[model samples]
Target: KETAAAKFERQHMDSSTSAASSSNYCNQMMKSRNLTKDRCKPVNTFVHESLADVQAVCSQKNVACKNGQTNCYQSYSTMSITDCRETGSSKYPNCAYKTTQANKHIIVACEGNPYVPVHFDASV
Candidate 1:
């Protein structure tokens, strides 16, 4: 089974890329990253920062996750990120996405003994 910590990295972490451009970016990445396996993910944001910087967010702020969990934290400062939102025409295996890049303070759900991020909750 994939640990929550590892799943967060798999779905949101993208330190290897400096920027994401072109209309095909979201389409390619959404599939390449395996996020489109069973169904289209409505939204996903990729952080263009180091793992350490992302982990540091655990101590930044207290927020509530969408599910009402109190373990969520917000980033202290804005960081570069690529937001992928499913297109209106998106359907099943033909998942399509619109890409938008900006600097945003991310919100994440943290847990475990180390209090590291386990889920990419949102961005603001």
Candidate 2:
């Protein structure tokens, strides 16, 4: 079974894409990374940093999750990330996404049992 942390990694890691840029970046990525299957993910952010750098965010700017949980944290440094948003025309099995790359601090929800990331709540 896939753990929450494992799920987070599957959805968010994109180290190879650090220098990758293209309007089709999301269209290809969302599909290639398997985020656009039965439905569009709506919004997701992928970090260009190494896995360790991304994981270390757990010990920074701790905050409350949007759902009011207290296990979320904000990254201390502005990171290289690409924001993937499903366009209005996006449809199941033929998804279309708007890709925008930017440097922003990220907010993520983590599980307390092992204190690892689970959900990517947002970017700030």
Candidate 3:
């Protein structure tokens, strides 16, 4: 009898592995195709960030987003909008809003895994 959290984790773990493997395969294919600049980068498929880190950023910025609200933030060199609740915003009005003409980088991952992270870089 796995708990709900456990089940979710299991599912996402598998997904992460699948994604990583697929990405690796694609990279190999691209190399074989002699692609130069479009080569796939080595990305961790099952890489997730700690909740503490996410919360730290959220709290540091004093996020206040509402439920189902999407907010974009700038990081690294990209702009990305993550679901407030999904990022532990709880809901809308609990997260803050900001606009960035520069790039905002974001770290995305499976909720349960919290280890598989995907980096997103947005540019205007």
Candidate 4:
């Protein structure tokens, strides 16, 4: 079974390559990572930090998720990230997305044994 940790990595981790210059980063990434299937993911963000670094957030101070869940944590350090927002006219299978890069402290929800990030909450 693909754990939520793996799912989180697929959806959010992007430490290896620098996607800063790619206007098409989200276009290819969201599709390649299987975020685009029957429908487009409305919004997504990819963190430009190592999985270990991102995972460490699970051990940081806890906070409440936007939905009032208490499993979230906000990173102490800022990290580079790329936001992928679906275009208004985007259709299924196309999943068009515009990329916006920024540096900010990220928030994520974590769970499971050995705990790791399962959801990308927000960047503040």
CA lDDT of each prediction against the hidden true structure: 0.91, 0.86, 0.27, 0.91
* TM-score-better candidate, 1 vs 3: 1
lDDT of 2 at 31: 89
Each candidate's clash count: 0, 0, 28, 0
Better of 1 and 3 by lDDT: 1
lDDT of 4 at 10: 94
Put down candidate 1 lDDT per residue, 6-79, tens digits, no spaces: 98999889898877867778888889889999999999899999999999999998998888999999998998
Candidate 2 runs further than 4 Å off: 112-114
Cα displacement (angstroms), candidate 2, residue 46, comes to 0.9
What's the CA RMSD for each of the models? 1.2, 1.4, 15.7, 1.1
TM-score of model 4 vs. true structure = 0.95
What is candidate 3's TM-score against the reference? 0.21
Q: Candidate 1 at 32: error in angstroms?
A: 1.0
lDDT of 3 by residue, 1-124 (tens): 7554443233212221212222133333323323223422222122133433332232222111333223322223232222111123222322221211111334332222333222222222
lDDT of 2: 0.86
Write model 4 residue lDDT over 1-124, tens digit each, in one string: 9888899999999998755678898998899899897689999999988889999999997999999999999999999999999998798877799999999999999999888899999999
Off by over 4 Å in 3: 1-47, 62-104, 107-124
